[PDB]
């Protein structure tokens, strides 16, 4: 892992296999159609972030301070989501 920085609409539309991305600010995120396996985010922040479609597997969120985040279609549930601060977070749709 390498320390993450603050990216405006990162829209990292490529798939990741790295384990961790410790350090995150991610203001106005625009992630779309990214397939994480074995990926983790620790000590990360998300404001006005947007997830379109993530086929996440074995990936969990730790110490993530979501604020005003909409996920639309995702594989994220309490099972794949570790304890962390979430406010004004919405999960419109989910997949099996």
């Amino acid at each position, epitope marked *: 892992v390498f320390p993450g920085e603050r990216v405006e609409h990162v829209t990292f539309n490529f798939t990741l296999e790295n384990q961790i991305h410790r350090g995150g600010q991610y203001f*106005n995120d625009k992630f779309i159609g990214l397939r994480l396996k074995s990926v983790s985010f620790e000590d990360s922040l998300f*404001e*006005e*972030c*947007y997830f*379109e479609d993530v086929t996440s597997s074995n990936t969990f969120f730790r110490n993530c301070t979501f604020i*005003n*985040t*909409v996920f*639309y*279609n995702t594989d994220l549930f309490e099972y794949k989501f570790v304890n962390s601060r979430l406010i004004n977070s*919405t999960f*419109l*749709h*989910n*997949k*099996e």
Partner: nanobody
Amino acid sequence: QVQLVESGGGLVQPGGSLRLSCAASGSIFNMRVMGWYRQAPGEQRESVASMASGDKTTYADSVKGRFTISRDNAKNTVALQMNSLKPEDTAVYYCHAVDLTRNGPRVYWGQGTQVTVSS
């Protein structure tokens, strides 16, 4: 604030169909156009389906061969084509909009419309 429009409630027979059309106006900036949810007596809203962005869609597995979604962005509308309306599966149907503007994500909900089944 985006004004959303709800419609299409009432009695339909199994084998018949209804068009529940979502529409919205004001402050629309290439939005994810309203998808559909089913509200039961119990406090909860089941996902139905969405064709909100691009030409792609996700339908719930629970609505396979029952709820079909078609979208016309040039109009900011979504049409739910209700079919296979088995008598027990009634609900209040809701439009769920997502704002993709410069101030970040925002969402809107309508009051919903009640659909029942004729027999």
